[PDB]
Design an enzyme around this catalytic site. Structure first.
Site, short mmCIF file in Angstrom:
data_model
loop_
_atom_site.label_atom_id
_atom_site.label_comp_id
_atom_site.label_asym_id
_atom_site.label_seq_id
_atom_site.Cartn_x
_atom_site.Cartn_y
_atom_site.Cartn_z
N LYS A 1 0.84 -1.18 0.00
CA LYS A 1 0.00 0.00 0.00
C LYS A 1 0.88 1.24 0.00
O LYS A 1 1.43 1.62 1.03
CB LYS A 1 -0.96 0.06 1.20
CG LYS A 1 -1.90 1.27 1.10
CD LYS A 1 -2.16 1.89 2.44
CE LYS A 1 -2.83 3.23 2.35
NZ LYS A 1 -1.83 4.34 2.30
N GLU B 1 2.11 7.85 16.16
CA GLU B 1 0.69 7.74 16.43
C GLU B 1 -0.03 6.72 15.51
O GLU B 1 -0.81 5.91 16.01
CB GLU B 1 0.01 9.12 16.38
CG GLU B 1 -0.95 9.33 17.53
CD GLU B 1 -0.33 9.29 18.92
OE1 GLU B 1 0.75 9.91 19.10
OE2 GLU B 1 -0.92 8.66 19.83
N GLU C 1 8.87 1.59 11.67
CA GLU C 1 9.95 2.57 11.50
C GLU C 1 9.23 3.90 11.69
O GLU C 1 8.44 4.30 10.83
CB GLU C 1 10.59 2.42 10.11
CG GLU C 1 11.39 1.13 9.96
CD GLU C 1 12.82 1.20 10.46
OE1 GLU C 1 13.29 2.32 10.80
OE2 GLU C 1 13.48 0.14 10.50
N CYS D 1 12.94 11.17 8.30
CA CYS D 1 12.82 10.58 9.64
C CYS D 1 14.13 10.78 10.42
O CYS D 1 14.10 10.94 11.63
CB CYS D 1 12.41 9.10 9.57
SG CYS D 1 13.71 7.99 8.94
N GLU E 1 8.44 17.43 16.44
CA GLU E 1 8.95 17.07 15.13
C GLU E 1 8.38 18.09 14.15
O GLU E 1 7.15 18.21 14.03
CB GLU E 1 8.57 15.63 14.74
CG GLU E 1 9.39 15.05 13.60
CD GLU E 1 9.29 13.54 13.41
OE1 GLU E 1 10.03 13.00 12.55
OE2 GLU E 1 8.47 12.91 14.11
#
Lengths: 489, 489, 489, 489
Positions: C185, C241, C261, C295, C392
């Site tokens: 996906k 989340e 991850e 990230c 972030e």
């Protein structure tokens, strides 16, 4: 600190086979002397080829399928090795005193260094016994393929005179953890600790024939073990020249596997950004430990020009303050040299350094005209083509050389036929890693010296040896790989 | 099926050094002759000590720090090996035709067996180049300890005449994947595929000096490689006698590491519950494949008494229908033998069988006086003390021995100084596993024979060799372990 | 540098199942827009649970015993992955242009960084296919015990919008090398490169059903994959989340294995003895690479007081000289932000930093009141409890904080719930190793940033993830351990 | 055989934190009652959230850098584990008597089975402490890359009532050997052996806070451990339903790592060529051991049609001679059941079998109204859709199913959501290996049942669990991987 056992009566002086004590077949005996008191300790049974033949047949029967030792489960072999380490710790003071009497090393060094190394090595390898694993290999849809790490069989161990019990345990621990049987030959100069360990092996519960010990000489016992057609593997620690003879005899006879732990021309590199006091103490202990009679001994101390003069000065102060005397005395840091042949050989090289151009900074002669003691010697202004910088001294002599650049010191350190150990002293991350990588040495120490662990492999590049001792890598020397490939119909 | 090349002309006959072709320094040349047509293919340059010295120097310069080969990243060495495998697949027909002209083995055998193994081995080791990992070892709170698996350096390879290119690839694939440099010596009898590979190695992009090829003889080129003070490792495939000379010379010079793949006295064990048609056909291929001139050849076929007579009967029938003849001819299952010597020793072994009491069941003499071919021979009523059951035949002779119990056959199978391969045929789970664990052989095949994989290690126990080829185990032969210990302040 | 394909026609916009292109079951479609031109690129088929169900059944049939994919030998799976890497390299310019159109990243960054990462990752894992090995375990004399590393089965991959093709390949390469089947996906925002890769998967020769791709939304496709009772494993890259919701759905349904991850609050520590110019350029690229949408982005740049002021000055000069514009332009280093929601969110945090006490050193607003471009922003005087140092950002903002001691900066760097990456800049061996050890982060870079390798594992400690991607460690996430224990009678 | 302790008084009933005994902060206590004598043994302290918070804080302080536990060298943690194993061997009779008083299992079963496993597991993992090695990874010429296998931190353990101390040891041994700290919660039904272990942990020398024990209930103590933001890892043994709640709560809070060992619907496969007396006796022990209250219990016995009637006949005879009764009585093979619930569900499953069409062959009702004991039951003519073949019985009920082909039985055996263990009985090599590879189970036993080793990993496929216990694989559950990448200038 334990109480030094000044006068100990030796109990074990015979050939150990099938857990029994035997006189030599010929009746012959040889004397073992104390290098400090210069007096004979006792007479040990002297073996020859017929004694080795009886020891190899004992080890073969113990290794045959269905024998008590072969049908023992993996965890029971580990248990036996832990039982032996307990017995070694119980009789630690007796063992360390025997080592001091035979070698001349300080009693406290044999108690806290040699005996601790033995106990640790035995406990580490006792833990590998049920963790020796092969592989399952993916191949085809209709094939099952796997490897087994089987014991080699009868193993011969030939050990040196400098660390007699330690070098024996380095070979015995992984060999027995892997399920092999052994024929041991202690050095002619130092047989007492090996024979003591024999009694502890019987006491720990090892079946008879698993460990056999034959004291004697190199051209007789050593040659018989090297050439035996029923010994599958041999592990040897000693000189490069004798190492070459062992490997050739092994090839000529039955192509038995051979581990070799030989000599080195070990460099010790001190950079301008090093913590100078740390570098001085480490290079000092690296040279003078065990009276300079160590395979890891720094034979070439390279010091960067910016700190050369201060390095020389601080090293000289350490050398003059080093206590030389009776190894059974608490303050002693340096005992006598092993024998007259070694003692005269060191003094011959010390005299050579004087007439070659080196600057004798301190020492240079015997302590007294009666014993085997040599005063801690430091030579400055040493160059690459001098005898004191080219040859293995095996005594208390520190040759300090000078370098300017890292690329230069890499070329000078790697210009030898040897490659056992190297040591680097710097505070700079890039220098330390560039030197760790470019030095052709089996072990590279950074900001330390003689830092040995049961779990870290040890051995030489080039003419310093073949194979490794210690760590998981030592298991590969004591096992044979078998591939089983099954085709399903 | 591919078409064989009619008048294939050889293009590469010179010494390969620094990616260039050179004539021998002496000017000497030697002839390579087609064993089938008995005519000279060409004159290859004949190297000696000074050509070996020129190849070792070129390999040492390619291995120096900062060289294009050393500074290449791990994944790029794998990319080069994949590029070489692609060229070997493209020129597969040329290489298989060269192999047929040199060895006389059927063109379809060299195309679908030898060249297939070469391609699979190159592709397998191309995948290991970025996966050779050392260890991080836990010691003390303030110490960082690790091992590096570094390349050894200059590797010499010495290969046999029976599988020239495949035995070369078995050494070259892990050596290059580990970052070493090489000096190769093909067999004097079969040097054409090795020379062709050299052109492919240049085309693939390997830097100069990484692979150097020196054709020549054993006592001259081979001896110089064995004794070279600047060769760090040697890999040898051939006889136990020559392997001993190679290992002795290596120990005498600089203690270079030596891997040996030698012969064996390989048993076949057929149990009463085997699939008898599978065992007959596998033991047949095991004895007669490549004219019995293979290190994996079965030289003792043990059959349980219950199936003995029927096994002998079906083996005799199977051996009679075997097509022997012209190598380039599609129908040929067995081309000619290699040489006059051993051909005479095979017929002398055959006569020894008749006089010792064995029953000749079929064959037992030469085919038709216009080439050295033997008629597939089968002996029954064979016993252990007989010559046909003790000597390595290296020809198409099947000795069938009888056994009653598993315990007995284990003891008789292992009563040898050798231990390369073994094959077991049984449908029983416990018998198969009891025999797999009790046989002293590097490889135990169950319900198959000659089942080899680039991913499964191969090598001998006892006098059948030292070290392993293929699998992850091959990498230990081409790397040196370095321990780096860092003590933090 | 390749020529930027300014106008490319999209060919692949459908659901990929069993190597066929399908319209969504409902008929629904969703638009994909270019964040630079702010125009719609095309409409992609929008999947839901019924499309996921057809994709999972396709993956199950491809995984069933006896299927072409299950009976393929290990080396053939590796060959297929190498064939796919070749096709990815052939269509590298088409793929990089699709990535730029969907994400807004510079065409040269997608060509030389994202596409190179994909090709390398595919080639590294193609090499593991025949090297996934289990163990043979020593137990008792009468027991044979071993482990098999079997494929898990159907694997679901849910990928993010920042590195769409790279994060997909990170999951696909080890899953297919291990012999699993997949349901993919892609992110709703970036589906084009995944659908392109589908055509290359069919072209490479993978059997139908091995890889299936269903574009769509998180609450529909994502939730259907997370909760599917016939998917055995799921790998997810994205926010902490959403990662928590994925793991809970996985537990609630069938206890499928889950790799995560997730995000981080990545510290970048600059010591007083660092090579300041290196530290400035690395911290700069670490923050601003991919428009701060990484990230691994440095969210907290800690600088020692002795170099703080100069660090701030040199960083500001880099930020002002950074070229922001059309990603298809050779000079562009920073494209637009992904969308309006991200763009407004970054500006909201930039405004928060102004009213919290930080010193705006440069930037702080949009480039033009028409596009999604944000000017490179640097904030000085940042403290631990400010929003710009706690949250972030996922944009081009560099918060520079100050520290005095190492023990202090260790406590401040580890006071987060996250632990993805860390970077340390120093020339001192002891500082670098003390910090490598004490920082609670999955990857610690020393004197570099964003240094990723296919062979080195990557992932988070604490709430930054579960499991690892890349290296040999990624195989453990895609295999199940089976112990086979056989007792001999 | 040892003598059971008559009036053994319990000494440890409090909460164990920081090597001290504490009363619950609420003052509450709960009763532990002997299931055999039906009388209260004692009142144990009942912990809740604030006691769990006090234990987690103590574990966090013991895990801090510089703490006595963290600064201990790798070999010393192994020494502590060996010291604990010695105390467990010394107090073996006390621990086995506590286990009998709490669970009601025979004293000789707890002495020779449970306590034996505890001792072997502790000794096995004591050997891994100095052998947990990371990797050195090859990347580029100027990069040093490595991985460290670091402890995770605070580990929570939640164990069941059937094997209280053994399930506790399976988690504690690898956690402590890896250097973690722990918070344990024994089952509410069986907390006495866990509390006794705490006194041994203090005696052995473990620093305070390394092991903390909090007795209590699932919804209170267990829920607090599952949701704790400062617990990094949790290990759970119990049911699939409770395991799902634990994993969901872990994902909802801080993404702590979770190992799960759950139930299964374990098949037994008996082929026509099996040793029928071996299979009957192994399938009997597999179904009736520990009153069928074991995660490894066989719940489906598939028998090939050729041996079906005879297998049923011999199983019925074997089940009739089984001695059930008093646990402390030497002759007892099966003590009482655990509780009233499930006892009623077993009799309801038994009645469901009769009504669905199965043939009750023996047993099928309660024993004698003065304890919950069931008469060993055997059902024949069982089919897949029946309740006795679909539900996890957890009682002494043997459902015997019939099969004709291997392909059919593989499909029927794997048609479940579970996959903990499987057992195959055949004398055929190909059938044994085809079934071993095709069965989807964490463990496949061949010609044995319940053959467990501290060195072989154990765990479930599908909904039978996540992760593995025992073997080198257990260490991956208790360590976090850190990559350190250093770029040289």
């Amino acid at each position: 600190l334990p109480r030094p056992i000044r006068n100990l009566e030796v109990k074990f002086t015979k050939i150990f086979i099938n857990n029994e004590w035997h006189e030599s077949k010929s009746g012959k005996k040889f004397a073992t002397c104390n290098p400090s008191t210069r007096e004979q300790i006792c007479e040990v049974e002297e073996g020859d080829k017929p004694d080795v033949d009886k020891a190899v047949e004992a080890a073969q029967v113990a290794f045959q399928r269905g024998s008590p030792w072969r049908r023992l489960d993996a965890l029971s072999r580990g248990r036996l090795l832990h039982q032996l380490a307990d017995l070694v710790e119980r009789d630690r003071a007796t063992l360390a005193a025997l080592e001091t009497m035979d070698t001349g090393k300080p009693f406290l060094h044999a108690f806290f260094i040699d005996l601790e190394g033995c106990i640790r090595t035995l406990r580490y390898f006792a833990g590998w016994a049920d963790k020796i694993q092969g592989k399952t290999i993916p191949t085809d849809d209709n094939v099952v393929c796997f490897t087994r790490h089987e014991p080699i069989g009868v193993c011969g161990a030939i050990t040196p005179w400098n660390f007699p019990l330690l070098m024996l345990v380095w070979k015995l621990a992984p060999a027995l953890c892997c399920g092999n049987t052994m024929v041991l030959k202690p050095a002619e100069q130092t047989p007492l600790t090996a024979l003591y360990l024999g009694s502890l092996i019987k006491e720990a519960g090892f079946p008879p024939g698993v460990v056999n010990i034959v004291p004697g000489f190199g051209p007789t016992v050593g040659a018989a073990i090297s050439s035996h057609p029923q010994i599958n593997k041999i592990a040897f620690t000693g000189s490069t020249e004798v190492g070459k003879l062992v490997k050739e005899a092994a090839s000529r006879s039955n192509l038995k596997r051979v581990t070799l732990e030989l000599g080195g021309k070990n460099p010790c590199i001190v950079c301008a950004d090093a913590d100078l006091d740390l570098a001085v103490e480490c290079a000092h202990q690296g040279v003078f430990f065990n009276q300079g009679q160590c395979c890891t001994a720094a034979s070439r101390v390279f010091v960067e020009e910016q700190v050369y003069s201060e390095f020389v000065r601080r090293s000289v102060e350490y050398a003059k303050k080093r206590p030389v005397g009776d190894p059974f005395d608490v303050k002693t840091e340096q005992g006598p040299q092993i024998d007259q042949k070694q003692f005269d050989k060191i003094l011959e090289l010390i005299e050579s350094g004087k007439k070659e151009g080196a600057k004798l900074e301190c020492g240079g002669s015997a302590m007294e005209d009666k014993g085997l003691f040599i005063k801690p010697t430091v030579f400055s202004e040493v160059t690459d083509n001098m005898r004191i910088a080219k040859e293995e001294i095996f005594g208390p002599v520190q040759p300090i050389l000078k370098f300017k650049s890292i690329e230069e010191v890499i070329k000078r350190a790697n210009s030898t036929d040897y490659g056992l150990t190297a040591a680097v002293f710097t505070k700079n991350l890039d220098k330390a890693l560039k030197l760790a990588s470019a030095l052709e040495s089996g072990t590279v120490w950074i900001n330390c010296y003689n830092a040995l662990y049961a779990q870290a492999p040890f051995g030489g590049f080039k003419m310093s040896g073949n194979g490794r001792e210690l760590g998981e890598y030592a298991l590969a020397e004591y096992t044979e790989v078998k591939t089983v490939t099954i085709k399903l119909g």
